[PDB]
Symmetry: C3
Subunit: 287 residues, 3 copies
């Protein structure tokens, strides 16, 4: 069957997505995950939730143990990983309150453990060169988009719909993230260059999470939450208004996530999961 | 009051900026600074000088302990940091002998300790996401620019002046640096790409020094020396003249800083750190 | 005295370039090389071969000890390094089966030890800032190109020959590589940006190998094998492996001919210039 793992970012440090059966602590060959995992069910579908930054949001993006988080979900039998990320916008049509079902990224991270395989003792033995041209699971991407439709949330498709038909708050059916290492935000010079490159949003947590999920043979899809990080540019009122907008976004994402879990459990994934595993084996360069 | 820390880059390994009142050898919770800190006064303004690469220039850019340098200056009560950096040019109006009071950068460094905060036991507790859209202290930038004006150095502002007003050598009133990790210089391929991105100069030492200074609640500003790393005898004499000019700028800048009140700016510097604590 | 080191990439894990005179297991101040170093002769030219990824290809690009590999070749008396790399294409005129004698690169690697010098106990004392504007040895580049001509392999020089004169398979007389850190391949987003930047090929192993070679005073040149990694877009794999196998055959011929061509010339002043560039780039002195 299927089992959906949920990596909750900012605004999901303490998830209460569903009535939890129990809390579980796990260990991995790559260290401890960010926190204990919340185990439960959405209908008849087993579901596990894991806060990326841990309760209290004490772990910065560059220090998150992405390998342990992904492998812990793997060892629990997860077949899919849905993830959230709070991001800043780089393009005019993506405004705070919108969401993005990402399909591309540009990686500007460094100093993070981004692979399970290598020649070091703390990694699995082998050399794995994974294809990443379309780095997400496309079937799971379209389930997030369909879940938004089922919850009456606007979906904007810039290939298909006019910019005048962009109704906020909307889910953008595609988008690219530039993942910076953090913890500082970008300079204006850096933001202008990323924008000139055509990137849609900026965040700090997508990579290596999406890469490691594919290495583990897991269907991974991310829903990004557009928020606002320039209240420095009436600060108490600005932060209060953005926090309220973000709270509304978290409500909608929780609705989308809960609907997406059910939509995953309603389909058969035998051939896709088999293809996920075979892609791992065929990417081994030592074999 | 105020206390101005000076981080001297290439050309400032053993600077004689003032009569030394006391040489002070310290360490920090993040390791040893690049060298002993030298204390003194410029007029009635307390000053502290620290060579970024240490005496003898034995520390390469990627191995400089930026965290320790910034923290040590903070520990001595510094309110400001003025820093120098020798850089190569990426644009035709930035010619060797010029200076740039930087206001922007693109970061291409890696493997450097770039923040005081984290979940590691070695780090300060908390998650700090500092805004960096305009990454320098603007009040201090304008003092460096005004210091150049007071020392009879041309100032060029491409926002307001035509290209025909760019008379060399000149302090460019704004500019962006690409900070590469080094120690090697860039390939022509990389230089072309950086140039097409609109970056003005290339150096190796600005990041994370500027980032950590804001984390520490300090007002940071950089004056870059445009030189030529690609001849040799004329370039070196030119660079010696640039160091003389920058020394004049730094001394005048310290006097200008001490002539103003910084209570509100300092309090704003500290409050920006607190408001950037995501864990709180 | 010239002595040519060879760093074999993918496809050269256990190469049979010449009769082995001595298999050498060496240690360097920066650790152990990827494997033992094999000494021999190509004609009268002393030669040393080393597989970049080791026997069995167990070392990924980001974990190769580039310092130890370059240092070990230098300590065995090598004056040159010829290196291969299997790469993907980013431009239409570079098709699988082509070779590229690289002359430029953009570095997107991180976390690798990229210099012999520093302030740490595991480093040579000093601060070295090497120029890299044209990062390869041009004399050795032209030898790789002439070797291709000598072995009856098409050579395309886009600054001299029109695009219609590009007959595949050909050796591209120039080219730029983007060296990503790996181990994963690029996204379409990243590949599109690298293509927009004018980069010709993508690989994972050029940097810091080329940088450390110049730091060691060695003449370094790379010949890149264009292959196909986008088969995901079963007959492709068998067709690409057969294509790659023929590419290895010709790169072997190019390397053996290049070694002979290196030995046919005097290198006294080029070697002295390589050493002088290292000393003139010391900023602590």
């Amino acid at each position: 069957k299927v089992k959906v793992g949920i990596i909750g970012g900012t605004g999901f440090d303490d998830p209460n997505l569903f009535k939890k059966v129990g809390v579980r602590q796990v260990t991995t060959p790559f260290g401890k995950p960010s926190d204990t995992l919340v185990e439960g069910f959405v209908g008849d579908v087993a579901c596990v939730v894991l806060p990326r930054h841990g309760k209290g949001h004490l772990i910065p993006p560059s220090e998150v143990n992405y390998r342990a988080n992904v492998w812990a979900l793997k060892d629990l039998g997860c077949t899919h990983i849905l993830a959230t990320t709070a991001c800043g916008s780089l393009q005019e049509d993506l405004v705070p309150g919108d969401f993005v079902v990402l399909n591309q990224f540009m990686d500007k991270t460094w100093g993070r453990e981004n692979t399970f395989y290598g020649s070091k003792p703390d990694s699995l033995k082998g050399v794995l060169h994974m294809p990443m041209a379309e780095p997400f699971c496309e079937r799971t991407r379209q389930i997030l988009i369909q879940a938004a439709r089922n919850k009456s949330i606007n979906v904007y498709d810039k290939k298909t719909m006019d910019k005048s038909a962009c109704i906020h708050p909307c889910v953008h059916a595609e988008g690219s993230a530039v993942t910076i290492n953090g913890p500082r935000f970008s300079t204006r010079c850096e933001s202008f260059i990323h924008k000139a490159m055509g990137l849609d949003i900026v965040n700090m947590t997508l990579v290596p999470e999406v890469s490691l999920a594919r290495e583990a043979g897991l269907s991974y899809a991310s829903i990004a939450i557009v928020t606002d990080f320039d209240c420095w540019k009436e600060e108490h009122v600005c932060v209060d208004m953005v926090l309220e907008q973000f709270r509304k976004s978290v409500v909608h994402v929780r609705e989308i996530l809960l609907e997406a879990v059910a939509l995953i459990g309603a389909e058969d994934w035998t051939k896709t999961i088999e293809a996920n595993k075979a892609l791992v084996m065929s990417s081994r360069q030592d074999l």
